[model samples]
Target: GSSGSSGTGALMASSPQDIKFQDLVVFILEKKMGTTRRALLMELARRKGFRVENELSDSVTHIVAENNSGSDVLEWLQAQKVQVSSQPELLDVSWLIECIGAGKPVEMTGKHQLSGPSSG
Candidate 1:
């Protein structure tokens, strides 16, 4: 499982960060972060050939946000009483930049994850 130990791209660094996505749809919260930048990111995701939903639905799989708390986002969702097929991964805007920079859906790791109460 040892990846390239080099301090740079090991596979192919030529193309740099422009990969399309699959069933992984994203939902950006204009609920708190505002609409100004939401539109920007939405377009960016679209440019990358990734599907993004303007409205929350069961089809959404990732909740991309800025500097927000796990509990805060949870309460926000609870306020809407929106229905979902399952709990979508709560992530920060940095995750978006990560994928954009990596030119792909890197991986679902805790670095990009916004935690929710589990043991409670």
Candidate 2:
């Protein structure tokens, strides 16, 4: 959660391998990957003008996920040999509210609605 494990060698720490990414693309593979924490993160990223992509591509950087089974999200990334890390952080709401209060956009997709913004 905090970063890499401390079990590795000192050389690993001082090298590029030790450098972890601060920005990441988290995929909640289930119904709601956007709970509280994820929404907050999204809002923060949105405020900062960071592009958060859900579709897997060669340009993708990192992956934070919940339930990834039976989803092509992880499979394609694996096939592409993309370095992906999974986290069990269930979406938290408090963080999201903070983001919203800060005027960050909470981007939610795949919801069943009669009418809304169309994303293609």
Candidate 3:
């Protein structure tokens, strides 16, 4: 009877993704940012209760990139032709690391904010 999806418990055995504790959906650009680091950071983000996605989707609110300029990242995104439903903010890795250290959502100021790919 492994199909026991009917627990009468007040709280289900939920994980971190859907809770929206920080209300931020993060997507790390694998380009320029090494795959290893991206995976590690993404793991840490999830460990700290942040929702990090493998692909750009309607839920993403923040898109993080590293080792790439605003234009470079924009160009890549332009080429990929990702979704536009959510105008996800382009952020530098610093912002992400800061949040990881702070163990909470840090300020989204100019210090960490990156220019999003131009939108019409």
Alpha-carbon RMSD to native, per candidate = 12.6, 15.1, 4.8
lDDT of 2 by residue, 32-96 (tens): 45556455555454444443444543334433343333234435344644443542122223323
Per-candidate Cα lDDT values, in order, are: 0.73, 0.37, 0.75
TM-score of each: 0.74, 0.27, 0.74
Over 79-104, each residue of candidate 3 has an lDDT whose tens digit, in order, gives: 76566775677788887787788767
Q: Which whole-number lDDT from 0 to 100 does residue 31 have in model 1?
A: 59
- Candidates 2 and 3: which is better by TM-score? 3
By lDDT rank, best first, the candidates go 3, 1, 2
Candidate 3 — which residues are off by over 4 angstroms?
A: 1-22, 116-120
Question: Candidate 1, after superposition: displacement of residue 45 in Å?
Answer: 1.1
Worst 10 residues of 1 by lDDT: 10-19
lDDT of 1 by residue, 6-96 (tens): 5654444443554356677777877567897777786677666667788888877888878886666777777766788887778887887
Clashes of each: 1, 4, 0
lDDT of 2 at 101: 60
Task: Please identify which of the two predictions, 1 or 3, would achieve the higher lDDT against the true structure.
Answer: 3
